[PDB]
Amino acid sequence: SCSIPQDLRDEIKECYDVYSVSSEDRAPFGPRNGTAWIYTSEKDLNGSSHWGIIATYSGAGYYLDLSRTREETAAQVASLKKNVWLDRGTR
Amino acid sequence: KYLKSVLRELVTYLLFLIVLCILTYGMMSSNVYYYTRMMSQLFLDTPVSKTEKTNFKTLSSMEDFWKFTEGSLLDGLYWKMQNRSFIFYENLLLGVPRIRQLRVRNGSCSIPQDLRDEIKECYDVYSVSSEDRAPFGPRNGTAWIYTSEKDLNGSSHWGIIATYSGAGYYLDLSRTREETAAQVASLKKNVWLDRGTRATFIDFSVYNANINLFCVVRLLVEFPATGGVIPSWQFQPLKLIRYVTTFDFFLAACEIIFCFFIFYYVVEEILEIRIHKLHYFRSFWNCLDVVIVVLSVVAIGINIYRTSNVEVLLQFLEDQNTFPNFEHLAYWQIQFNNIAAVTVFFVWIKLFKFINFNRTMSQLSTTMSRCAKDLFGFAIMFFIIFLAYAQLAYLVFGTQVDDFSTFQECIFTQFRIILGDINFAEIEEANRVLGPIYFTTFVFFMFFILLNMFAAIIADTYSEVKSDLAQQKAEM
Ligand SMILES: *[C@@H]1O[C@H](CO)[C@@H](O)[C@H](O)[C@H]1NC(C)=O
Ligand SMILES: *[C@@H]1O[C@H](CO)[C@@H](O)[C@H](O)[C@H]1NC(C)=O
Ligand SMILES: *[C@@H]1O[C@H](CO)[C@@H](O)[C@H](O)[C@H]1NC(C)=O
Ligand SMILES: *[C@@H]1O[C@H](CO)[C@@H](O)[C@H](O)[C@H]1NC(C)=O
Ligand SMILES: *[C@@H]1O[C@H](CO)[C@@H](O)[C@H](O)[C@H]1NC(C)=O
Ligand SMILES: *[C@@H]1O[C@H](CO)[C@@H](O)[C@H](O)[C@H]1NC(C)=O
Distance CA B316, CA B92 (A): 15
Name beta bridge partners: B203.
B98, B218
How far is residue B426 from each of residues B29, B33, B400, B431, B446, measured CA to CA in Å?
41, 35, 10, 9, 21
Tell me phi and psi for residue B98, to 5 degrees: -135, 140
Quote the CA–CA distance of A25 and B278 in Å, as a whole number: 67
Cα distance from A17 to chain B (closest Cα, Å)? Answer: 6
Ligand 5 atom nearest residue B138's Cα: 14
B43/B46 Cα distance (integer angstroms): 7
> B111 near B119, Cβ under 8 Å?
yes
Distance from CA of residue B443 to its chain's centroid? 32
> Which site among B210, B311, B313, B319 would you substitute to test the A interface, given the most A Cβ atoms closer than 10 Å to its Cβ?
B210
Collect all residues of chain B within an 8 Å Cβ-Cβ radius of residue A2: 210-212
**The Cα angle at residue B287 between residues B286 and B290, in degrees rounded to 5:** 90
Residue nearest to atom 2 of ligand 5 (CA): B140
Instruction: Return d(Cα B159, Cα B283) in angstroms, integer.
Output: 42
> In DSSP terms, which residues pair with B222 in a beta bridge?
B199, B230
Q: Is B21 helix (H, G, I), strand (E, B) or coil?
A: helix
Cβ B108 vs Cβ B122: under 8 Å: yes
User: Positive or negative, the Cα torsion across B108, B111, B113, B117?
Assistant: negative
B92 close contact with A: CB closer than 8 A: yes
**What is the Cα–Cα distance from B267 to B273, expressed in whole angstroms?**
10
Q: Check if the beta carbon of residue B29 is closer than 8 Å to that of residue B210.
A: no
CA–CA separation, B299 and B335 (whole Å)? 9
Q: What type of residue sits at position A66?
A: L
User: Bridge partners of B102?
Assistant: B199
DSSP B56: G
Element (DSSP H or E) covering residue B203: strand B197-206
User: What value, to the nearest 5°, has the Cα angle with vertex A3 and ends B213 and A88?
Assistant: 75
| CA separation, residue B50 to residues B47, B68, B70, B231 (Å) | 7, 12, 13, 21
Tell me the backbone φ, ψ of residue B234, rounded to 5 degrees: -165, 130
B246-272 and B4-26 helices, crossing angle to 10°: 140
Per the CB < 8 A criterion, the answer to whether B149 and B167 are in contact is yes
Closest CA to B235 of B18, B417, B41: B41
Question: What is the per-residue burial (b if ≥16 Cβ within 10 Å, else e) of B319-355?
Answer: eeeebbbbbebbbbbeebeebbeebbeebeebeebee
Where is the binding site for cholesterol, in residues of B? Answer: 335
Answer yes or no: is the C-beta of B140 below 6 A from any ligand 5 atom: yes
CB proximity A3 to B under 8 Å: yes
Q: How many CB atoms lie within 10 A of CB B203?
A: 20
Beta bridge partners of B395: none
Q: How far apart are CA B350 and CA B337, in angstroms?
A: 20
β-pair partners for B5: none
**Residue A79 CA: which ligand is closest?**
2
Q: What is the DSSP string of B335-383?
A: HHHHHHHHHHHHHHHGGGGS--SSHHHHHHHHHHHHTHHHHHHHHHHHH
B86-89: list long-range contacts, CB under 8 Å, 24+ apart. B87/B39, B87/B42, B87/B206, B88/B38, B88/B42, B89/A88
CB pairs under 8 A between A and B: 32
Q: How far apart are CA B434 and CA B401, in angstroms?
A: 14
Q: Beta strand pairing status for B215-222 and B98-103?
A: unpaired
Pick the closest to residue B21 from B247, B347, B244, B266 (CA basis). B347
Asked if residues B99 and B171 have their Cβ atoms less than 8 Å apart, the reply is yes
Distance of CA B326 to the CA centre of its chain: 17
SS3 B234: strand
Cβ atoms of residues B98 and B171 within 8 Å: yes
| Amino acid identity at A45 | L
- The DSSP symbol for B212 reads S
Contact B120, B219 (CB under 8 A): no
Q: What's the rounded Cα separation, in Å, for the pair B344 and B22?
A: 11
Give the integer Cα–Cα distance in Å for B299 and B344: 11
How far is A3 from B242, CA to CA, in rounded Å? 12
